[PDB]
Amino acid sequence: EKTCDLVGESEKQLALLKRLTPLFQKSFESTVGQSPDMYSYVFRVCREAGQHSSGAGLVQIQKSNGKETVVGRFNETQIFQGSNWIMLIYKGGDEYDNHCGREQRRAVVMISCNRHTLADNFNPVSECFYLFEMDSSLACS
Amino acid sequence: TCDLVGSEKQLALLKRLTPLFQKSFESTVGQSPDMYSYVFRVCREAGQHSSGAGLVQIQKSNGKETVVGRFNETQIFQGSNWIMLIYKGGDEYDNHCGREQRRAVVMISCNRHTLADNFNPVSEERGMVQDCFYLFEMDSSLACS
Numbered sequence: 001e002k003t004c005d006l007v008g009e010s011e012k013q014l015a016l017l018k019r020l021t022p023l024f025q026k027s028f029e030s031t032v033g034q035s036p037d038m039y040s041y042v043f044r045v046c047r048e049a050g051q052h053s054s055g056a057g058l059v060q061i062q063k064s065n066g067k068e069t070v071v072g073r074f075n076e077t078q079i080f081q082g083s084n085w086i087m088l089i090y091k092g093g094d095e096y097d098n099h100c101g102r103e104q105r106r107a108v109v110m111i112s113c114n115r116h117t118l119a120d121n122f123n124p125v126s127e128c129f130y131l132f133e134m135d136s137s138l139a140c141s
Numbered sequence: 142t143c144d145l146v147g148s149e150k151q152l153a154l155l156k157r158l159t160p161l162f163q164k165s166f167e168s169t170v171g172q173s174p175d176m177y178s179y180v181f182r183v184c185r186e187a188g189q190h191s192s193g194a195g196l197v198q199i200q201k202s203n204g205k206e207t208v209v210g211r212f213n214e215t216q217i218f219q220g221s222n223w224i225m226l227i228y229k230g231g232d233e234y235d236n237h238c239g240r241e242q243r244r245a246v247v248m249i250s251c252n253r254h255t256l257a258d259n260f261n262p263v264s265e266e267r268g269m270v271q272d273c274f275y276l277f278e279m280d281s282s283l284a285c286s
């Protein structure tokens with residue numbers, strides 16, 4: 001019954017967490033790259049993404065063989081709300097092998113207000129920083 | 142002007158933002174005594190005592206300026222209806238957040254009715270320090286796609 005664990009205990013962030021509950025059971029996926037280097041990014045809200053990555057909230061899957069690399073874990077979550085957007089952050093991903101000071105990967109998902117959908121249009125923006133975006137009326141105010 | 146921490150993509154993005162270079166943005170948050178004024182500029186000096194600052198925090202009680210981020214260390218990304226501008230290399234925290242260098246993150250949302258407006262931090266000095274993250278927002282049709 002594990003959900004998001006806030007990095008630190010902002011109640012403003014806990015309320016934000018309850019506001020996104022409607023997305024907890026949805027699964028977001030997007031595939032970029034081209035054969036044979038196609039990678040599938042699967043993202044979940046406060047639930048585990050991927051098939052072999054316990055605690056991962058967003059994983060990168062090599063389409064060729066299904067090898068999973070954790071980008072972020074929902075047990076190290078941060079969440080902020082702007083005028084018409086919500087920023088979700090998952091820390092504690094797998095460390096880089098020979099890049100970025102070999103630091104733990106991290107996922108940043110920019111959820112934009114879209115009054116015409118509860119959830120949709122998830123995709124990576126630019127892949128020491130993994131940026132993604134998606135639309136949701138939940139990020140509307 | 143801005144110095145990328147790089148990318149042709151961010152370079153085009155920097156030029157796409159030129160229309161905002163000579164404007165200055167300010168927003169004051171929190172109430173007496175501990176009120177703070179945040180001054181933000183695009184690829185241009187924002188501080189009065191802080192050289193190379195892209196975004197500064199001014200303690201209103203005494204005028205102490207803190208560099209939140211420098212434009213000589215810029216990063217820029219564009220989403221569907223937003224643009225994320227990042228200024229790293231701000232002054233280090235004194236007794237918070239591992240005493241690491243501050244950085245400013247500004248979320249520019251698409252707004253097809255203003256070239257630029259509604260600049261403000263997403264939280265107050267207090268909350269921002271607690272979260273070890275200085276996040277700001279503003280509107281601009283330049284962030285529209």
Ligand SMILES: *[C@@H]1O[C@H](CO)[C@@H](O)[C@H](O)[C@H]1NC(C)=O
Pocket residue numbers: 005055073075076092
């Ligand atoms: C998150 O969960 C992972 C499980 O592998 C653990 O290693 C890590 O310490 C946890 N992070 C925190 C700070 O809770």
Ligand SMILES: *[C@@H]1O[C@H](CO)[C@@H](O)[C@H](O)[C@H]1NC(C)=O
Pocket residue numbers: 144192193211213214230
């Ligand atoms: C940015 O400028 C400051 C001087 O104010 C300097 O300390 C820092 O090393 C510079 N960073 C880069 C990108 O060279």
